């Protein structure tokens, strides 16, 4: 529902071992992001700072 803002997480993009992430032009996460293993080869960049 109406969750408090902006307390939460955002989406910083995904990247695999065979694809390329256009938001960073690399197979990693930008500065200030955490890579999370969502699947066997999928990594999601999660941001914390607003």
């Amino acid at each position: 529902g109406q969750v408090p803002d902006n307390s939460g997480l955002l989406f910083g993009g995904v990247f695999t071992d065979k694809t390329i992430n256009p938001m960073t032009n690399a197979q990693s996460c930008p500065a200030g992001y955490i890579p999370l293993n969502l699947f066997e080869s999928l990594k999601v960049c999660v941001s914390l700072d607003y």
């Binding site: 500065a31 200030g32 914390l48 700072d49």
Partner: protein
């Protein structure tokens, strides 16, 4: 730590998330009007 999100609260002005060194030193005021 084992997936626990640990964060610290700091001034947004000081920490701008840039690799450039925030060299803020003199002056301590804008150029005063004539």
């Amino acid at each position: 730590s084992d997936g626990c999100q640990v964060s610290y609260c700091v001034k947004a002005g000081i920490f701008t998330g840039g690799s450039l060194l925030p060299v803020r030193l003199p002056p301590y005021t804008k150029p005063p009007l004539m």
